[PDB]
PDB file of C-alpha atoms in Angstrom:
ATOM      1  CA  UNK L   2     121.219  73.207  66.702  1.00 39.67           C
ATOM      2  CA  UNK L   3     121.004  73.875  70.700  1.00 35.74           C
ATOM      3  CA  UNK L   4     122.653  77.242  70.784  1.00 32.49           C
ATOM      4  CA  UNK L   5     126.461  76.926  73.402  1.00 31.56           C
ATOM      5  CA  UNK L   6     127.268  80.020  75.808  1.00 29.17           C
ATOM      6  CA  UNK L   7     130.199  79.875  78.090  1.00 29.71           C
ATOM      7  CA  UNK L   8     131.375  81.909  81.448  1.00 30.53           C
ATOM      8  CA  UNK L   9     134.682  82.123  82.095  1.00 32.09           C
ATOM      9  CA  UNK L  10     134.820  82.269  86.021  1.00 32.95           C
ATOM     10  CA  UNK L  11     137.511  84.335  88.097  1.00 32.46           C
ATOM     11  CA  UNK L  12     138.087  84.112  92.047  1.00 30.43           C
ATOM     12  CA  UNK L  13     138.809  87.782  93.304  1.00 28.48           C
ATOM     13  CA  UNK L  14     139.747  88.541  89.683  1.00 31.98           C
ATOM     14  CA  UNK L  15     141.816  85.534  89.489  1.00 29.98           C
ATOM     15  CA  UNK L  16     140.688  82.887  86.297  1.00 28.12           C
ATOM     16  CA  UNK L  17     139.325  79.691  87.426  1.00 28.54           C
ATOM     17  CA  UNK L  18     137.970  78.503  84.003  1.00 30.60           C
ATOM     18  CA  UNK L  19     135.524  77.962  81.590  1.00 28.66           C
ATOM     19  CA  UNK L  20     132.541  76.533  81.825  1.00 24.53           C
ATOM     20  CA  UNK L  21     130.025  76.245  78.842  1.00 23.14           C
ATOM     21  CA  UNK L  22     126.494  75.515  78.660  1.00 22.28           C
ATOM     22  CA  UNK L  23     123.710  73.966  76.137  1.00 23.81           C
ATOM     23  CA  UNK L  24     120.808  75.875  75.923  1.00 23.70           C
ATOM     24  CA  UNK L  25     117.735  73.385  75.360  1.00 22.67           C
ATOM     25  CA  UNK L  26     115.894  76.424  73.009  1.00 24.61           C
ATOM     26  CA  UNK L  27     114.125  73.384  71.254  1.00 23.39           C
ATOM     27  CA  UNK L  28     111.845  73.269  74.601  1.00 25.33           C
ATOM     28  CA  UNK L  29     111.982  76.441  76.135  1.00 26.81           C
ATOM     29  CA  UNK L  30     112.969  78.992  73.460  1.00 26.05           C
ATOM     30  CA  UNK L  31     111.827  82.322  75.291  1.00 26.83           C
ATOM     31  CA  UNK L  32     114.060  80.920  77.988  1.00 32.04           C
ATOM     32  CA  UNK L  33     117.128  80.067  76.362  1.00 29.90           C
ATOM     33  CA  UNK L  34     116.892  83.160  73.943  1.00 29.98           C
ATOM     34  CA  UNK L  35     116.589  84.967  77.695  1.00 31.84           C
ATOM     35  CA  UNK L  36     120.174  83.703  78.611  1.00 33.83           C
ATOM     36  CA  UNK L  37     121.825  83.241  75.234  1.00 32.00           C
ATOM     37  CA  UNK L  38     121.171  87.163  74.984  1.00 34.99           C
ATOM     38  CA  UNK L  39     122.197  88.093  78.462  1.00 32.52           C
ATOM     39  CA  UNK L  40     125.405  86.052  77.570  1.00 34.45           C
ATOM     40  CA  UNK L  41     126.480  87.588  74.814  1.00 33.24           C
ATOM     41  CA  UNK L  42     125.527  91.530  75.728  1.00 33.57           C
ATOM     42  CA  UNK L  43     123.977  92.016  72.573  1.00 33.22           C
ATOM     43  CA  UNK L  44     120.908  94.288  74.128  1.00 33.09           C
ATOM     44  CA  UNK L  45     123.393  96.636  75.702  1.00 33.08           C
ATOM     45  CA  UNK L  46     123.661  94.504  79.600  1.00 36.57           C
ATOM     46  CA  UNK L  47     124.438  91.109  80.716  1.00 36.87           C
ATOM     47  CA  UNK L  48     126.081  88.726  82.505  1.00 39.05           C
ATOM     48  CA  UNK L  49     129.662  89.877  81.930  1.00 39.43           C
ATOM     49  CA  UNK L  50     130.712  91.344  85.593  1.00 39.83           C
ATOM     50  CA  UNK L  51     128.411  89.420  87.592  1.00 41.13           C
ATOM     51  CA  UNK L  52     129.222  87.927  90.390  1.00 43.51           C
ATOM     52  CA  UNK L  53     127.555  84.093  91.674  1.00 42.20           C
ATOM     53  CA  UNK L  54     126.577  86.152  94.793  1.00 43.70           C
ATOM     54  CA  UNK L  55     125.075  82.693  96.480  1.00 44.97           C
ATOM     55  CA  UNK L  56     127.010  79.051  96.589  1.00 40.87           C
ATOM     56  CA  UNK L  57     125.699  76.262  99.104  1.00 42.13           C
ATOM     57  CA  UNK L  58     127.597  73.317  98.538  1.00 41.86           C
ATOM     58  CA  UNK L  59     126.203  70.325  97.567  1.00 41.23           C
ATOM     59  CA  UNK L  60     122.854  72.149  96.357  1.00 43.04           C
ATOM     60  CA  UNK L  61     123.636  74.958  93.511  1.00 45.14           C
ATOM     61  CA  UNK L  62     125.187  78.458  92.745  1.00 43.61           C
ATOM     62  CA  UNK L  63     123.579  81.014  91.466  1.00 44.91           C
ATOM     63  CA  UNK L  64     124.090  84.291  89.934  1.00 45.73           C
ATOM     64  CA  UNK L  65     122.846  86.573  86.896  1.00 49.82           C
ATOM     65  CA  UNK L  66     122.320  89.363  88.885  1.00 47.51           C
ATOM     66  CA  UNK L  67     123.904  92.101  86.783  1.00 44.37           C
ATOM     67  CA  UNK L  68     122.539  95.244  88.898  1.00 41.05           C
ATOM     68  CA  UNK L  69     124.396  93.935  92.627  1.00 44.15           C
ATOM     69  CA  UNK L  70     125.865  91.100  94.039  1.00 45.53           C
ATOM     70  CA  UNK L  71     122.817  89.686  95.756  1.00 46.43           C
ATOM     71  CA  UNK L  72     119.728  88.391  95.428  1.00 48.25           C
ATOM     72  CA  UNK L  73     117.399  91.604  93.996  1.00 50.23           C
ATOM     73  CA  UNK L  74     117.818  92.245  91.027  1.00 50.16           C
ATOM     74  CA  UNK L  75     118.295  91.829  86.938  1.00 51.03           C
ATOM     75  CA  UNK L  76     115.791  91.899  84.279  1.00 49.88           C
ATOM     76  CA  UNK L  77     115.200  89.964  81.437  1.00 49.18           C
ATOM     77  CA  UNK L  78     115.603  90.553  77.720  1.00 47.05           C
ATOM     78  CA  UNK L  79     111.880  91.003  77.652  1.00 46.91           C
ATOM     79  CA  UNK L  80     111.174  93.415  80.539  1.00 43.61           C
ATOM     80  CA  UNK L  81     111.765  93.078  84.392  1.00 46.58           C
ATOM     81  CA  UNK L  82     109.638  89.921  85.135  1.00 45.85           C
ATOM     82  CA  UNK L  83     108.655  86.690  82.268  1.00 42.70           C
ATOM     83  CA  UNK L  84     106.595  84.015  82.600  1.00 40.48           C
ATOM     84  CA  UNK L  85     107.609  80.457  83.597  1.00 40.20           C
ATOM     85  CA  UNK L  86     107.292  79.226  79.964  1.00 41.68           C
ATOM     86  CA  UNK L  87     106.573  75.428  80.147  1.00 39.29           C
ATOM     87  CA  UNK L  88     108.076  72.825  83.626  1.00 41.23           C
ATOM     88  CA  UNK L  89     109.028  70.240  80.888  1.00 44.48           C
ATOM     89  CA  UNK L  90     111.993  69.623  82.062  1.00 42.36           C
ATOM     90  CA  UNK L  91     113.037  68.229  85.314  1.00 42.53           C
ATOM     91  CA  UNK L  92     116.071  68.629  87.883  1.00 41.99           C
ATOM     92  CA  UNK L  93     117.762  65.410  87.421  1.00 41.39           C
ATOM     93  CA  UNK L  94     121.147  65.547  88.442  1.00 41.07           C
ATOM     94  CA  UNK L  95     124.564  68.218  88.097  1.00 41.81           C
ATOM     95  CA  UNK L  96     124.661  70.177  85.690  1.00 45.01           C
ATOM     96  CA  UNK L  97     121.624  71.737  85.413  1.00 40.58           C
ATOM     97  CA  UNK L  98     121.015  75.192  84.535  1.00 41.16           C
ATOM     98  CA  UNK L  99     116.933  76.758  85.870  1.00 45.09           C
ATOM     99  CA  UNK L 100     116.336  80.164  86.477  1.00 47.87           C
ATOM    100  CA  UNK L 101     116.124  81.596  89.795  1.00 51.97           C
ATOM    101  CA  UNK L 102     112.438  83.354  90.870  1.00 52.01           C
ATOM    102  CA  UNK L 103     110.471  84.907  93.459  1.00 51.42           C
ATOM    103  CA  UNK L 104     107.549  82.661  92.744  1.00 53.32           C
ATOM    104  CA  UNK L 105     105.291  82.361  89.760  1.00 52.73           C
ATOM    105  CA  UNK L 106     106.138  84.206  86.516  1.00 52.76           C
ATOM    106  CA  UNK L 107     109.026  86.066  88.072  1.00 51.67           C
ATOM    107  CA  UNK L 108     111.742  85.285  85.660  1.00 52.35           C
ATOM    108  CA  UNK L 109     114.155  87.845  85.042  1.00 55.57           C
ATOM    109  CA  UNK L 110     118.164  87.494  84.459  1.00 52.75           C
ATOM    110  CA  UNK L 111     119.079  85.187  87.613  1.00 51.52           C
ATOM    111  CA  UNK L 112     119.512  81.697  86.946  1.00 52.15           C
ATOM    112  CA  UNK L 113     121.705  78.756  89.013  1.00 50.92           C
ATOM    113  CA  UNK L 114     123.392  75.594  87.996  1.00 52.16           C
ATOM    114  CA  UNK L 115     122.631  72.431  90.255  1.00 48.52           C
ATOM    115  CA  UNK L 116     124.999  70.332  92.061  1.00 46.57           C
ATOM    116  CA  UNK L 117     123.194  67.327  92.942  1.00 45.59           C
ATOM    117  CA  UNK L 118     119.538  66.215  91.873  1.00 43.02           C
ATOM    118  CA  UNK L 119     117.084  69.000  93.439  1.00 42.13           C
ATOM    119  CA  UNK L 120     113.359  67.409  92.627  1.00 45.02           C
ATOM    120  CA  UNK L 121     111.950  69.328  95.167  1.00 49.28           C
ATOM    121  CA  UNK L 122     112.375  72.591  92.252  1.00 48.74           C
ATOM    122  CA  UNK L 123     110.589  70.788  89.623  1.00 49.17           C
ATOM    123  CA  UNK L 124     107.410  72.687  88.123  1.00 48.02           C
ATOM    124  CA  UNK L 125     108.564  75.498  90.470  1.00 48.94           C
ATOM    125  CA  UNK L 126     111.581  76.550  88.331  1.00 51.94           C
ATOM    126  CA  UNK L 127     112.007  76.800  84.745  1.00 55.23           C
ATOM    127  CA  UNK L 128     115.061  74.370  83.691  1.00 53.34           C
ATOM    128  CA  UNK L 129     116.369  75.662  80.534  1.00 54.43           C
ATOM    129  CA  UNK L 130     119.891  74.281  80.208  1.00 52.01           C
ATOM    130  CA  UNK L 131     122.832  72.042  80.892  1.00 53.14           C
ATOM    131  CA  UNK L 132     126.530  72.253  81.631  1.00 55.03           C
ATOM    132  CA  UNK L 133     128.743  70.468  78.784  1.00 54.86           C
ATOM    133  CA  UNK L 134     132.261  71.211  80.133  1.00 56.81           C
ATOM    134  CA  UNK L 135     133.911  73.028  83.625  1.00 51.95           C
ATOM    135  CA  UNK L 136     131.517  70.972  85.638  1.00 50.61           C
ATOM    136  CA  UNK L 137     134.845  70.804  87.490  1.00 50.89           C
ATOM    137  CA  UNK L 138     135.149  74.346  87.534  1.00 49.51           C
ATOM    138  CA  UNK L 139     131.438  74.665  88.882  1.00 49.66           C
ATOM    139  CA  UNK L 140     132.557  72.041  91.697  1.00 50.51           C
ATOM    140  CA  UNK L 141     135.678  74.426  92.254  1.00 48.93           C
ATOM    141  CA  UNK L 142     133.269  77.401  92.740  1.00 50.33           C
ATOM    142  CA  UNK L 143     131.906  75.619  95.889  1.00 51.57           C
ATOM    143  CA  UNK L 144     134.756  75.897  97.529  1.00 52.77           C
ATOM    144  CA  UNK L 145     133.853  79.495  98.225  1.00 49.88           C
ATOM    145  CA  UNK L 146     130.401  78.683  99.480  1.00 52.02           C
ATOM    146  CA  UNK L 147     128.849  77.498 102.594  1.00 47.95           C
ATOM    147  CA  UNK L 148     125.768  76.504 104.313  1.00 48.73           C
ATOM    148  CA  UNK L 149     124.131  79.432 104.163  1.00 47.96           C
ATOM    149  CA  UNK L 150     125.316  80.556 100.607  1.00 47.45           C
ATOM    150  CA  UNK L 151     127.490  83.418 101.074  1.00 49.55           C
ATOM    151  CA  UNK L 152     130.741  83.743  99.589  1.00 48.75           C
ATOM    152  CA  UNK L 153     134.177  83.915 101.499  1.00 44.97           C
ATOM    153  CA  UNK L 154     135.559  85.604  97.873  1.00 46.43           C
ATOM    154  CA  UNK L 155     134.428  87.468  94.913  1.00 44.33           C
ATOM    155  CA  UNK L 156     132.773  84.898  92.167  1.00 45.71           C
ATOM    156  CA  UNK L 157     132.483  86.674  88.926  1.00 49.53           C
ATOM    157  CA  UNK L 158     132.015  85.947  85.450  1.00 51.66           C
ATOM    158  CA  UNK L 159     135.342  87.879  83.779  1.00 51.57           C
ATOM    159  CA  UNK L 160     133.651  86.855  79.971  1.00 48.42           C
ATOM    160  CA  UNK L 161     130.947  85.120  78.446  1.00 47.54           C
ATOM    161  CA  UNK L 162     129.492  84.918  74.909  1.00 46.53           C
ATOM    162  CA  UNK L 163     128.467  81.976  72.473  1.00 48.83           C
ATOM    163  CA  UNK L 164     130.566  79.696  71.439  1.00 52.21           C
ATOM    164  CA  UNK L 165     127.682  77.890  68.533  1.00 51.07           C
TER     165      UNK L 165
ATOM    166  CA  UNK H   2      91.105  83.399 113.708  1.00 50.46           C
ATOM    167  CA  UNK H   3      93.411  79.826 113.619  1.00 50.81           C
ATOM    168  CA  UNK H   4      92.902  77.852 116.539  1.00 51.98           C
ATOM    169  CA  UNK H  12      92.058  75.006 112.292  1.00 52.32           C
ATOM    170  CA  UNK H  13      91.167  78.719 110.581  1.00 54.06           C
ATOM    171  CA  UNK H  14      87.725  79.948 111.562  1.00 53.58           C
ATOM    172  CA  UNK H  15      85.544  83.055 110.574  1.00 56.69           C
ATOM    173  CA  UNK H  16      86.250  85.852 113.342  1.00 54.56           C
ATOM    174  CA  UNK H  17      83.457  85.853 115.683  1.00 56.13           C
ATOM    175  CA  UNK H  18      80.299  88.631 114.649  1.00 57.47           C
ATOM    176  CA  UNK H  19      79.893  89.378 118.559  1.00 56.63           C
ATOM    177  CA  UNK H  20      83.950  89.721 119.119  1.00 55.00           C
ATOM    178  CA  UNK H  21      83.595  92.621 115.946  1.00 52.62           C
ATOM    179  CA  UNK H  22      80.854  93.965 117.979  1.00 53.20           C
ATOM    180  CA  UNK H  23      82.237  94.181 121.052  1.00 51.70           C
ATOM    181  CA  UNK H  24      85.452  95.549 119.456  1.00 52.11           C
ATOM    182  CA  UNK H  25      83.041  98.413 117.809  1.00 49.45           C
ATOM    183  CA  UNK H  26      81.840  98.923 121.085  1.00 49.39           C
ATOM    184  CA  UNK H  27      85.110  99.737 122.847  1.00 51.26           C
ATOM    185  CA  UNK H  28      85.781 102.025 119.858  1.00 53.79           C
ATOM    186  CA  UNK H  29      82.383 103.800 119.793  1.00 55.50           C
ATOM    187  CA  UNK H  30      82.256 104.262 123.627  1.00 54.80           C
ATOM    188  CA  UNK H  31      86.580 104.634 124.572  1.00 52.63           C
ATOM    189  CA  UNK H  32      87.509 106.174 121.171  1.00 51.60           C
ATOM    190  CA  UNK H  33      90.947 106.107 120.931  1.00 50.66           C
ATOM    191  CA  UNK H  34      92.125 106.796 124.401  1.00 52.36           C
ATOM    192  CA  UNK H  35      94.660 104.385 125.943  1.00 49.84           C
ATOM    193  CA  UNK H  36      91.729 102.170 127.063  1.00 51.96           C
ATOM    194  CA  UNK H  37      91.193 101.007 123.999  1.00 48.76           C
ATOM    195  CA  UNK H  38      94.964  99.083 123.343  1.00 48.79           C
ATOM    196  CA  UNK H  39      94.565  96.403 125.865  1.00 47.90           C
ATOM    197  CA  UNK H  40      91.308  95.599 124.728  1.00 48.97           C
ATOM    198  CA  UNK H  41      92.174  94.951 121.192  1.00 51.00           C
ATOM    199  CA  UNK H  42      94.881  93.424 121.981  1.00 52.08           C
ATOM    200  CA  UNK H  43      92.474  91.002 124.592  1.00 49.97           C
ATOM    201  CA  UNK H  44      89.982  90.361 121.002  1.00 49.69           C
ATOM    202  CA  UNK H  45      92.355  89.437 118.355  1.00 50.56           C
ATOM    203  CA  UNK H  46      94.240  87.024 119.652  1.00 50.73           C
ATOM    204  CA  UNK H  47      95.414  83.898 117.120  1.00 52.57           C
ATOM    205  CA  UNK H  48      93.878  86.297 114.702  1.00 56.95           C
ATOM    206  CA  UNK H  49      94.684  86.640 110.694  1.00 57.42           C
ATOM    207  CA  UNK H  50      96.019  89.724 108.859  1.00 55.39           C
ATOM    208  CA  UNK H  51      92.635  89.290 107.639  1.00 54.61           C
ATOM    209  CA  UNK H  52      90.990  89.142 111.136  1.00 51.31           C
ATOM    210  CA  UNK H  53      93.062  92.488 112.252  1.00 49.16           C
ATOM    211  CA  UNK H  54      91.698  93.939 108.095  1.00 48.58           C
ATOM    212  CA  UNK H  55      88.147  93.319 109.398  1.00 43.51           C
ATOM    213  CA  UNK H  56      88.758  95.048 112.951  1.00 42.69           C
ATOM    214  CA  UNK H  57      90.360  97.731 111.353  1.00 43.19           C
ATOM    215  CA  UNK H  58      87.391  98.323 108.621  1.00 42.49           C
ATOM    216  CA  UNK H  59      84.752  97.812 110.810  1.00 40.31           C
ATOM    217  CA  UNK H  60      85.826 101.150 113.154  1.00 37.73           C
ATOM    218  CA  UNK H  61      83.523 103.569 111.290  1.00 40.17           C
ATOM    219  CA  UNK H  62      84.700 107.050 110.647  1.00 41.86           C
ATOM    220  CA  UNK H  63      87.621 108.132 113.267  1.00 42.41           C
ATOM    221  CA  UNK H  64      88.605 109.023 109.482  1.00 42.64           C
ATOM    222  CA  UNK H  65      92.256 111.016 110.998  1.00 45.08           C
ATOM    223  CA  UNK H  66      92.817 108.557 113.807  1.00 46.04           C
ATOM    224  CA  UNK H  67      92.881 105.434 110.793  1.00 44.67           C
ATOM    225  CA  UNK H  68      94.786 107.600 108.076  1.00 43.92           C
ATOM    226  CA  UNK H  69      97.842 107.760 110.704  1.00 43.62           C
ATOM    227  CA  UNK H  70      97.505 104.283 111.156  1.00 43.48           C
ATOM    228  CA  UNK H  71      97.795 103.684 107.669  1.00 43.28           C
ATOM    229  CA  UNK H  72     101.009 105.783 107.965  1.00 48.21           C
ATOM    230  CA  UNK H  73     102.491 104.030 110.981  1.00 47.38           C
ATOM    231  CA  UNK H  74     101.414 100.364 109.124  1.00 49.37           C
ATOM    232  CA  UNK H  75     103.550 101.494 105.627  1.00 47.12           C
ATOM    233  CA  UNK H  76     106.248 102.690 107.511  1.00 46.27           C
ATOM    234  CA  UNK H  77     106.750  99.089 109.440  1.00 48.49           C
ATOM    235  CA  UNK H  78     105.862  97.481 106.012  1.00 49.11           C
ATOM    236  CA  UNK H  79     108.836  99.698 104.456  1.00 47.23           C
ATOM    237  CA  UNK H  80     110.783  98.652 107.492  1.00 46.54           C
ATOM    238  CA  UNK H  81     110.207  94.979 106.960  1.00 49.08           C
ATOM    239  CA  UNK H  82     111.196  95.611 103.192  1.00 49.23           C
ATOM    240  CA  UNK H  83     114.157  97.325 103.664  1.00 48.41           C
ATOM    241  CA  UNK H  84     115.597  94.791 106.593  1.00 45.57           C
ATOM    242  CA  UNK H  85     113.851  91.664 104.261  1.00 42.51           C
ATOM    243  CA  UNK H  86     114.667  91.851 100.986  1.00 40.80           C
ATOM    244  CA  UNK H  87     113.125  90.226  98.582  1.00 42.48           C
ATOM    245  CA  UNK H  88     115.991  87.799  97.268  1.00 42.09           C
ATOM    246  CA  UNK H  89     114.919  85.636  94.775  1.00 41.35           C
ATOM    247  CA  UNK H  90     114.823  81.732  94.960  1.00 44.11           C
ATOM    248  CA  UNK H  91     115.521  78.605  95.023  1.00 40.21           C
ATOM    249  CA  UNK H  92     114.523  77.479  98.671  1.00 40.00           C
ATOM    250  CA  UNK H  93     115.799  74.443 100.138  1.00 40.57           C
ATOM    251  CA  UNK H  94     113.308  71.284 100.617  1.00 39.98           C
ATOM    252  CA  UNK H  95     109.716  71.672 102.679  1.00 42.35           C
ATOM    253  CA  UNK H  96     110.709  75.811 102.913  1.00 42.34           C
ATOM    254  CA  UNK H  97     108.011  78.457 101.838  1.00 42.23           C
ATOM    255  CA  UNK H  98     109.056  81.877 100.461  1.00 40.60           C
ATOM    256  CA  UNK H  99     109.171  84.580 103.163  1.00 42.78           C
ATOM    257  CA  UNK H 100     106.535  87.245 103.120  1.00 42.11           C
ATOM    258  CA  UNK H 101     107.076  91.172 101.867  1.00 41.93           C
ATOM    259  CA  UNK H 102     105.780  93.629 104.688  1.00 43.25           C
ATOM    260  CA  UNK H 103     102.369  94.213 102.630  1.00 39.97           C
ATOM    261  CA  UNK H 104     102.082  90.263 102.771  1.00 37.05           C
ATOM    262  CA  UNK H 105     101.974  90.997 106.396  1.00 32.92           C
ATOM    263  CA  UNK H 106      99.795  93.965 106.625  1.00 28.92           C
ATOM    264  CA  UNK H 107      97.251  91.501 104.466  1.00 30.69           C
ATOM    265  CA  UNK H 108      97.471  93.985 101.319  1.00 28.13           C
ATOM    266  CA  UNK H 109      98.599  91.540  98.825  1.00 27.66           C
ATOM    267  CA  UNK H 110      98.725  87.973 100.583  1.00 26.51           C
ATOM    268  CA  UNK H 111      95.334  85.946 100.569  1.00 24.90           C
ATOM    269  CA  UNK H 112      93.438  84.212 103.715  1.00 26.24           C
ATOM    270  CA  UNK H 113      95.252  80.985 102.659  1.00 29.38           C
ATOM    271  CA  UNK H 114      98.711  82.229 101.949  1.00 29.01           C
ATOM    272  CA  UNK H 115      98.442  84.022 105.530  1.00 28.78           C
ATOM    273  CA  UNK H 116      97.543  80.460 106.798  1.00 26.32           C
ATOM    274  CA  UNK H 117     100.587  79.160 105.412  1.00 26.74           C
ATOM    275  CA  UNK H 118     102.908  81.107 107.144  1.00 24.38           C
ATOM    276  CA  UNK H 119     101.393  80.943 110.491  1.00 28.20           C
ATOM    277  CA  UNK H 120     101.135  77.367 110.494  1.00 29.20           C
ATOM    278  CA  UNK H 121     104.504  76.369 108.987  1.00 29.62           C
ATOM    279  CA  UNK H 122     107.166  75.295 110.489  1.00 29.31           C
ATOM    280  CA  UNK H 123     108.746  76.761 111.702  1.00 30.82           C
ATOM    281  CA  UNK H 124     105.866  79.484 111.500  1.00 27.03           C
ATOM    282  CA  UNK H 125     106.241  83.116 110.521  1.00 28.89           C
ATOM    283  CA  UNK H 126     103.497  84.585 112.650  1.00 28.69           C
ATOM    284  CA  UNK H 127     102.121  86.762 109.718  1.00 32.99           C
ATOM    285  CA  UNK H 128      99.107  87.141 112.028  1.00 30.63           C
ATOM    286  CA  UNK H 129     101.489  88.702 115.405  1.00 34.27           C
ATOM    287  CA  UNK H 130     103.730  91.031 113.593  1.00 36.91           C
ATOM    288  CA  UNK H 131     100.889  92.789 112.014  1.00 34.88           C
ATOM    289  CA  UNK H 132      98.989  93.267 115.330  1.00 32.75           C
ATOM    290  CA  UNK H 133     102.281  94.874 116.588  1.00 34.22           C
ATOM    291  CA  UNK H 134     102.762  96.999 113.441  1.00 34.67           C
ATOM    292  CA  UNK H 135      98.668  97.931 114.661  1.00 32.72           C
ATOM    293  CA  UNK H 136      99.874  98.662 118.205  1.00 32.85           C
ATOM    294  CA  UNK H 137     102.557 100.662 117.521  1.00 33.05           C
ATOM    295  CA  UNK H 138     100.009 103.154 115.532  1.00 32.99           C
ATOM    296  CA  UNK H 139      97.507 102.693 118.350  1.00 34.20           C
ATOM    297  CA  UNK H 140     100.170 103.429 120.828  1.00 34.52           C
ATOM    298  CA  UNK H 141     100.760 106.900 118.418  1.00 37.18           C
ATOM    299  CA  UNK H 142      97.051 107.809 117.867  1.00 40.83           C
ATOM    300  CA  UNK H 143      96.471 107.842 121.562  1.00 41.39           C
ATOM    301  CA  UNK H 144      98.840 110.632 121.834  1.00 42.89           C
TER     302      UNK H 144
END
């Protein structure tokens, strides 16, 4: 089965809720394995006290950068950079869950959840995931956006883990 | 240089040599390369760079003056990772500009985006401000 991974989102330490994601490991293994590790701390770091350090509303938020709340940083479970594995599958819609790069094979721990179709990213970043539940709460995290993508408060994930 | 790309002109190297062999690096010799690289590549400014022979201490500080800009750049220019919105191109790192790690056509790309990042003009300023040093 598809492993599950929730965050549980706070708003300047405040809980928003839970939102939970299926990791499509069937296509992209590497790539799920990747964020199903980083979710669960089970190498030692991870995505438990990161912040979403870039919202634009009506595009995506994005986060997974465990070193600072910004754009440089993170590594992956498999060193600082990994390959794009495969460009299988496709931004179609909310929901879905790609990792964030600095070009080619540049993977490393950030990643952002779309909130509207984004075709424009397909076979440029690696979509490796959907959200199941909390798209509401991902909806509620735009609030806190803007235009440019900086926050007015402090996005983090409080907890996160596996949930199957 | 783009004007379209084209090769940089044999005689324009040649007269830029010239200036160099005859003017060294006295304060004559700013204005004129500023006069022959105009529209020109990162590439374009590589070749006029490599085609001064020897004046081996007057291109090391140079070098020097071109890394610190290129750390500048860096340090002001982050490297923030993706995604970009529609019909937007991924900003260059300062040895992108300085033509160290960015090819012909990537340089291209910038300078004739649009908007443009003139890859090709901050890197002949980076040059000028060493110039500007070496005279001294």
């Amino acid at each position: 089965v598809n492993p599950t991974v929730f965050f549980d989102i706070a708003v300047d330490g405040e809980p928003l809720g839970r939102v939970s994601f299926e990791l499509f490991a069937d296509k992209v293994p590497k790539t799920a394995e990747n964020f199903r590790a980083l979710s669960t701390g089970e190498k030692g770091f991870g995505y438990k006290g990161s912040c979403f350090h870039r919202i634009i509303p009506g595009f995506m938020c994005q986060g997974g950068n465990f070193t600072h709340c910004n754009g440089t940083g993170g590594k992956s479970i498999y060193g600082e950079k990994f390959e794009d594995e495969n460009f299988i599958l496709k931004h179609t819609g909310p929901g879905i869950l790609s990792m964030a790069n600095a070009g080619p094979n540049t993977n490393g721990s950030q990643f952002f959840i779309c909130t509207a179709k984004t075709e424009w990213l397909d076979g440029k970043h690696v979509v490796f995931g959907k959200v199941k539940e909390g798209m509401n709460i991902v909806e509620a995290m735009e609030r806190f956006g803007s235009r440019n993508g900086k926050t007015s408060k402090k996005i983090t994930i409080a907890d996160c883990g596996q949930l199957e | 240089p783009i004007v379209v790309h084209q090769a940089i002109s044999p005689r324009t190297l040649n007269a830029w040599v010239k200036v160099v062999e005859e003017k060294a690096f006295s304060p004559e010799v700013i204005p004129m390369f500023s006069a022959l690289s105009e529209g020109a590549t990162p590439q374009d400014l590589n070749t006029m760079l490599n085609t001064v022979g020897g004046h081996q201490a007057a291109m090391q500080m140079l070098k020097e003056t071109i890394n610190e800009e290129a750390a500048e750049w860096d340090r002001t220019h982050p490297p923030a990772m993706g995604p970009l919105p529609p019909g937007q191109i991924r900003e260059p790192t300062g040895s992108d500009i300085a033509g160290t790690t960015s090819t012909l056509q990537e340089q291209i790309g910038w300078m004739t985006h649009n908007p443009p990042i003139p890859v090709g003009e901050i890197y002949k300023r980076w040059i000028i401000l060493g110039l500007n040093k070496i005279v001294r």
